[PDB]
């Protein structure tokens, strides 16, 4: 899922580099909110057919992560695994192998 500690420029550039379709979603570190992160998904308006959206996330008080109150987890891997089946609160589900 995540490639490392990239998500603003690096991610937005690699997300549109090879032409990886929807589902290529990665996790990174927030530059404005440490301890939390922002989902970098290749989501568009369907007119451009090429764009990246940043979903600002918040860390759980009990020590976890959740994009929505309808699906909260404790680890990133567990979160990814659940969104890898379907969309629990995003524009698209996390269905992608790798793109290194």
């Amino acid at each position: 899922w995540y490639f490392g500690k990239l998500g603003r420029k690096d991610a937005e550039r690699q997300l549109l580099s090879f032409g990886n379709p929807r589902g290529t979603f990665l996790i990174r570190e927030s530059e404005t909110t440490k301890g939390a992160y922002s989902l970098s998904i290749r989501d568009w308006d369907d007119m451009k057919g090429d764009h990246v959206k940043h979903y600002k996330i918040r860390k759980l008080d009990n020590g976890g992560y959740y994009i929505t109150t309808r699906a909260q987890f404790e680890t990133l891997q567990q979160l990814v695994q659940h969104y890898s089946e379907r969309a629990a609160g995003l524009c698209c589900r996390l269905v992608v192998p790798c793109h290194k």
């Binding site: 404005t32 922002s38 940043h54 979903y55 600002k56 929505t68």
Partner: peptide
């Protein structure tokens, strides 16, 4: 302000 745009499916 950062470009934060959360899109849920509620």
């Amino acid at each position: 302000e950062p470009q934060y745009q959360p899109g849920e499916n509620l």
